[PDB]
Design a protein around this ligand. Structure first.
Ligand SMILES: CC(C)CN(C[C@@H](O)[C@H](Cc1ccccc1)NC(=O)[C@@H]1CN(c2cccc(C(F)(F)F)c2)C(=O)O1)S(=O)(=O)c1ccc2c(c1)OCO2
Lengths: 99, 99
């Protein structure tokens, strides 16, 4: 599909038994999801944006479905106000910017 | 052009006769540039991000040429970690997400 940017590019994602709305975000290197208790090993990380840094937990090889498109990769979990699908997963679902 | 997302979508912009690199950022409502001088009246504003809130200066009706495409709109200037082109200008240049 084609998503215009008149409004925030929110789409439905699935991670386990959780459906959530998330931004397709070309400005995000990494995928950052709001606080959730995922299974498995993780490592602590800091990520920076407007206003400074937040502490996140990095989980590897997590499957996520994004508008029915399958993805699997690193997801950062932490105190973000919005679920952010970053470039690591945007590429896996074939997402490009066009103008 | 079509822009893939295996690398950051950084582009050259022209503003006030100056060339800068900026990130095409579909997760950003607003265009926010690092500290710079722009002419004319501005208004103090505060905006939020992943790390908290910052103070910015809001300049209206500023021409920016983004990758050869002309925009005229609101530019916020302040302590963003990198120059970002947000949806307010991405829409002007006809940018969409496609997968
Ligand atoms: C500023 C960019 C260079 C980076 N950000 C991505 C931007 O697209 C963010 C996404 C975002 C959107 C909403 C809340 C928080 C983050 N966008 C922005 O910073 C601004 C913030 N923002 C906003 C608007 C209204 C309210 C608010 C809030 F109240 F939540 F702060 C934020 C908005 O529209 O764009 S980022 O989210 O900070 C980010 C994401 C992934 C990363 C990373 C940094 O480092 C490694 O991996």
């Amino acid at each position: 599909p084609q998503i215009t940017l008149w409004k925030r590019p929110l789409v439905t994602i699935r991670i386990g038994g959780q459906l959530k709305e998330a931004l397709l975000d070309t400005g995000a290197d990494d995928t950052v999801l709001e606080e959730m208790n995922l299974p498995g090993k993780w490592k602590p990380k800091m990520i920076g944006g407007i206003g400074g840094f937040i502490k996140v937990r990095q989980y590897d090889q997590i499957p996520i479905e994004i508008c029915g498109h399958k993805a699997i990769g690193t997801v950062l979990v932490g105190p973000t106000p919005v679920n952010i699908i970053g470039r690591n997963l945007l590429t896996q679902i074939g997402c490009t910017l066009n103008f």
